[PDB]
């Protein structure tokens, strides 16, 4: 249990679902425990409805949960579709804020970076729920992964345990997460305009350029009307896009960013965070 965690190990499990949640900035581990159990209740109660909707068989008969490969390494935690091997989630080992087994269930929690919105939980946690006969071992193995990552940090940098313990190691990692949360959370620089677009099915908005120049590497608006895009105004060619239905865009290529605008097809309710204030200090492609 060390040499192996570097290459990784795969545990089988059933992905029941994920849920976002509101949270205080930096709560206790006991509070994180509450959050996880509320997350698991919501997902289980949703799966229960899903099973019903499934029994009534519209057309196909796709299951409500999905068998997955739970990859674990000192570097990350990847959930892959057991059969298609398509990646469903890839979390840098350092982004996991809370992991735990609750019976035969494993919950993975992570901070959801996102510009705030105008008592109240102002921060957002994303919570992934899995089921496995080996929930206990998965949790233990992930824990073991943190330690080997630590030991490998000292080694790789020629540092000795007596100087940097694993606790300070954790603290360093949390601080960095916390910082990045705060960063994007208050990125409400000069115009965190929250939008709400309407759409139906298959249809799409349009296409725009990106690459903001060290700044909130987001995306700049660039044409495409008629469809939902400009159909509601409140948008401008040159308005930086921060988030899209939950996931931030600060620090992302185009395969993911422009890939999301491709996944909004069957939405009918798209959330967006734009800073706008443009536009100065072939042709075309929808999707």
UniProtKB/Swiss-Prot annotation:
Annotated PDZ domain residues: 194-277
PID domain span: 7-181
Tissue specificity annotation: Brain.
Protein name: Amyloid-beta A4 precursor protein-binding family A member 2
Shown residues within the full chain: 365 to 750 of 750
Organism of provenance: Rattus norvegicus
Superkingdom, taxonomy of origin: Eukaryota
Domain-related comment: Composed of an N-terminal domain that binds STXBP1, a middle phosphotyrosine-binding domain (PID/PTB) that mediates binding with the cytoplasmic domain of the amyloid-beta precursor protein, and two C-terminal PDZ domains thought to attach proteins to the plasma membrane.
Gene: Apba2
Stated role: Putative function in synaptic vesicle exocytosis by binding to STXBP1, an essential component of the synaptic vesicle exocytotic machinery. May modulate processing of the amyloid-beta precursor protein (APP) and hence formation of APP-beta.
Subunit structure: Part of a multimeric complex containing STXBP1 and syntaxin-1. Binds to the cytoplasmic domain of amyloid-beta protein, and to the nuclear factor NF-kappa-B/p65 via its PDZ domain. Interacts with the N-terminal domain of NECAB3.
Lineage: Eukaryota, Metazoa, Chordata, Craniata, Vertebrata
């Amino acid at each position: 249990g060390s040499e192996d965690l570097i290459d990784g190990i795969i545990f089988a499990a059933n992905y029941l679902g994920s849920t976002q949640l509101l949270s205080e900035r930096n709560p206790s581990k006991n509070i994180r425990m509450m959050q996880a159990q509320e997350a698991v209740s919501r997902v289980k109660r949703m799966q229960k409805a899903a099973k019903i909707k499934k029994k009534a068989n519209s057309e196909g008969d796709a299951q409500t949960l999905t068998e997955v490969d739970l990859f674990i390494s000192t570097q990350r935690i990847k959930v892959l579709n057991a059969d298609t091997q398509e990646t469903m989630m890839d979390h840098a080992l350092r982004t996991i804020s809370y992991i735990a087994d609750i019976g035969n269930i494993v919950v993975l929690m992570a901070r959801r970076r996102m510009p705030r919105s105008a008592g109240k939980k102002q921060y957002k946690m994303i919570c992934h729920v899995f089921e496995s006969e080996d929930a206990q071992l998965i949790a233990q193995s992930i824990g073991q992964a943190f330690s080997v990552a630590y030991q490998e940090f000292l080694r790789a940098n020629g540092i000795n345990p007596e100087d940097l313990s694993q606790k300070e190691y954790s603290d360093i990692i949390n601080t960095q997460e916390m910082y990045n949360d705060d960063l994007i959370h208050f990125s409400n620089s000069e115009n965190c305009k929250e939008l709400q677009l309407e759409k139906h099915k298959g249809e799409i908005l349009g296409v725009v350029v990106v690459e903001s120049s060290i700044l909130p590497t987001v995306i700049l608006a660039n044409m495409m009307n008629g469809g939902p895009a400009a159909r509601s105004g409140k948008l401008s060619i040159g308005d930086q896009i921060m988030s899209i239905n939950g996931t931030s865009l600060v620090g992302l290529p185009l395969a993911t960013c422009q890939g999301i605008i491709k996944g909004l097809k069957n939405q009918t309710q798209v959330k967006l965070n734009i800073v706008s204030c443009p536009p100065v200090t072939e042709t075309p492609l929808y999707i």
